């Protein structure tokens, strides 16, 4: 036989005492290791200095040789998830007598049931007790309902064995959430650690619970519920953490595909291993299949024609997975970095139809993640109020969350280095954590996912724009109706405009108005940079368009904004390239096609409509036109109001009306540039100045020029009249 | 008529002959676009509306343009004569 | 539902139905707090929600087939009569052509101002007639197929020839 | 555990009840055979397939007298998800003739002669019994174009 | 730190002698590196060109390389001092 | 498995004696793809070329096939076969 590894299963027996600190090992294995039944057996998860001494031995031939059962009472300490391999060692050490022990409570309740009859009766049956304090379900609390868990924190080797005897030692009642950190005991992963993906985690929980806990409903339905779940997203979004936490929180068997480790030079070894693991999963009703890095294990057959260790394994896994019965309760989890590299056969909605999409967390999700991380960290080692966390989240945009962990680690490193350098190895209690160190670390390390498909520009309010409210009201009444009054549109018939064109002179605030409207509206906003997609990707631009359009369609109705579209249609000026024609026809057949496309609203902004073909400007697509010209007197006055509010104004000797009248020919960017130049001129003399004089404003106005010619304005006006 | 079949016509205060006379220079796509613009103008006032007036149609006609120049029509006619 | 299920095919329809069932189960669990599934049933709104949630996997089709009648176009009936009795002869009067002689016109050209309804009239005629109709867009096939355009053209021509007139 | 626990029948111990059910109880998780009505919308294709299986199988003597080399290969090509595998499963379940299938990549191994020996054995087994049906799935993956890929391994 | 470019006229050939893909890539890269989500306070960008005619108009916008220095030929005093 | 096989085939062909009455014949779909060493008129000088049959050859083949099938199972005249 010589069983190198063993599988784990829970004890079918109920209650406590008898099932804990016990093993069910086949006598043949015990005979080979000459282990007396009245001795201690050591089990370790493939090593990791694990011993976990437990008493008693196995009995009865009902269980196979390989399987060994030790219940979840011991597995809750070393995170011994179901399906983990175990090792048996002959060496053992006689435990000594324990002393000065204590007991805690996981829940908020502290010091309850001092008589503790269940604990008292556990004293007589406590054999081979270990320090980490076995977690017990506590059964019935002798009236009062609910249950309270008990944990013991105080009582080479991961956990020193001990012998617990009544009277010799004194039991102490306390309350602690987890064990002491000086013993480096592993921390089980809970759902509280994962944050910012409440909808995603809820969807995953539902898609795991429905086929597993209630397979009979779908068996009666005759639907053949799917057994494959796909988690696709950028790396560093916690997909591995999600796979681990869903395994830990589920009592079903957990099977993990090693991948490259399983694959060897032997052609039949991979097939044999896959058949064995599938048979093991099918033998036991509750089981979950985990396939880490499915893209590497199952790459695209069309992209790479490798039949050595790629095509055969994909074919055999799909055949085995398609052949399982509907009555079974088994779920296969696959995580990939990109869905495009995944083989289309596996992406067919017959094997991996259930797909969970994880994206870059937004401001609120990042704030929640930061708060959860700070709560997990000790509260006495840092002081950071809500506003500081909000500021950090706002300044954190390109980071994915593994980047967040790296930022926290680098901040800790910098704090330690600064403390040792300055205070010469002072106690770390006084050093704490400062926001300045966090900012320094953020400057030090750049985001690892700066290149993003969609850019989430932080929110901007209507106060900054300071418009005349006419164009703002026009935009409010234009695109809000197709998003909220869909039922009214259906009752009234016709079709939604499904297109808005923002053409105007350069230096305007069309992008600012779009961002302000997106901030004001509660609908999700998606922004795509024009030159950043089609120019960078000569051939991948089409795939990028496909994926962004499908993401926008799936993630509820939303408005899409393009910074530049003039370069997206160069088919009329400077010849026509293949990529330009591809992206143009993709835009056309996405804006207009067989799909009704009611919820989706597209907003496009261009510097000049000259570089736009007449095919794009046709009835039913981007028909609406907005002048979005230079700001008027009121807008310039209101934007200058913020600048005058920044510093003192009454003693500066400047009047708003004269400033607006003199600067009537400038745009908002020119006004900002003039204000910056005036401020620089003011602060250059006498160093810091509490006010700015009109001479600085005049010097800034005369030094710089607007650079706008009347001919382009006339061309825009006649284009608007023509359109 | 097909577009206006969705709502009533008796209280709309619009006559069939003048509607075709005013929109003689447009096309079917232009007519559909004008109808959609008129419907949007009607529904953006007083929230939901069960009827549309002639003022909305006039505003939609004034705001929108046919966008077709007679030189294309002349070129098509001379191509047809040549063929 | 079938009319709104143009892109889906077979396994796509089965996946759509399965997604609708899953959405119904999730909604019932969320709202009624684990009520009996007998009264939950299936609603068309959930089917539409599932259809919006999951897109067809066979959207890219070499040939494109929406049904439309002659009442929608509302034409002068002159162009309609022309389209009705210029191309019906080759498909129905083959024996008449064989006995009389001569060759079929085997060609139709449609040139007009932009924004017209040539495609709408063609679709209406195809829907009215019982003859099989295959429509393929021009720019979408030869642009992305530098060498596969010939294969696609041959495939569509042979499919049209084999699958009846 | 057990797919179907065995039972012992004897007179008097149990009472027989008469009813009418299309299938057995759903709690027994028994597989449901696929019939002709399972697949729809392909009446012409299913009729052509029915003729193409019935004529060479049920009436071989007519074509033997004709001597016109009756066809033995039927090609079913179409977009994925159309229902070709359903047609194969239905024709396999509804036909009493012998059914043989080829795994494909699983059959192919490192030994060059192993695949040839396996193929010779499987066709010898097919020819041993007069009524036989051969099923092959994903021929393009198993046998790609020789001109496109110059791989003879 | 301060970043100084020896030559920048050749970095924007998108207007003269056609627009190659690499030229457009580097132009948009420098543009979105100079201006973007990052505040870019400490970093200072200095651009030097022999002739500003070979610079695209889209690069010369307020907030990006707006400041201009004539740096003309030296006068008699500077010439004497360097001599 | 290509160069060695070709070389040994050429060596064996060159080693055949004049007295020995042994002949080797092979069929290929395309002669251009054949190695020119084999195509050299020293080992494969004799070549039989089969082209596309004309109308008369096709008609002869069809008549032979129908004669083999025999008229007990079909009725047709020479005009039908010619057509």
Author numbering:
A (entry chain A): 29 to 183, 209 to 776
B (entry chain F): 694 to 776
C (entry chain F): 445 to 509, 511 to 610
D (entry chain F): 209 to 361
E (entry chain B): 611 to 693
F (entry chain E): 362 to 444
Q: Which sentences from the paper describe this structure?
A:
The type II AAA + ATPase Drg1 is a ribosome assembly factor, functioning to release Rlp24 from the pre-60S particle just exported from nucleus, and its activity in can be inhibited by a drug molecule diazaborine. Here, we report Drg1 structures in different nucleotide-binding and benzo-diazaborine treated states. All structures display a typical three-layered architecture, similar to those of type II AAA + hexamers, such as p97/VCP and Cdc48, and the NTD, D1, and D2 rings show an apparent deviation from a perfect sixfold symmetry. Comparisons of these structures indicate that Drg1 hexamers transit between two extreme conformations, a planar and a helical state.
The cryo-EM map of Drg1 hexamers treated with ATP/benzo-diazaborine was resolved at a resolution of 3.8 Å (without symmetry imposed). Notably, compared with structures from other samples, this structure is more symmetrical at both the D1 and D2 rings, and the six protomers are roughly in a same conformation. While the six D2 ATPase sites in the structure of the ATP/benzo-diazaborine dataset are fully occupied by ATP, the six D2 sites in the structures from the ADP/AMPPNP/benzo-diazaborine dataset are not saturated and appear to be partially occupied by ADP. Benzo-diazaborine is docked in equivalent sites of the D1 and D2 domain. On the D1 domain, benzo-diazaborine is surround by I422, T458, R297, and R429. Importantly, benzo-diazaborine contains an extra benzyl group, which is coordinated by R429 through a cation-π interaction. Therefore, benzo-diazaborine should have also formed covalent bonds with the 2′-OH of the ribose of the ATP molecules in the ATPase centers of both the D1 and D2 domains. While the NTD and D1 remain largely as a rigid body in all these comparisons, the D2 domain of the Drg1-ATP/benzo-diazaborine complex displays a distinct conformation that is dissimilar to any of the six protomers from the mutant Drg1-ATP complex. These results suggest that benzo-diazaborine has locked the ATPase centers of Drg1 in a specific conformation and limited its conformational transition. In summary, benzo-diazaborine blocks the ATP hydrolysis cycle and hinders the conformational changes of the D1 and D2 rings, thereby disabling the conformational cycling of Drg1 subunits required for substrate processing.
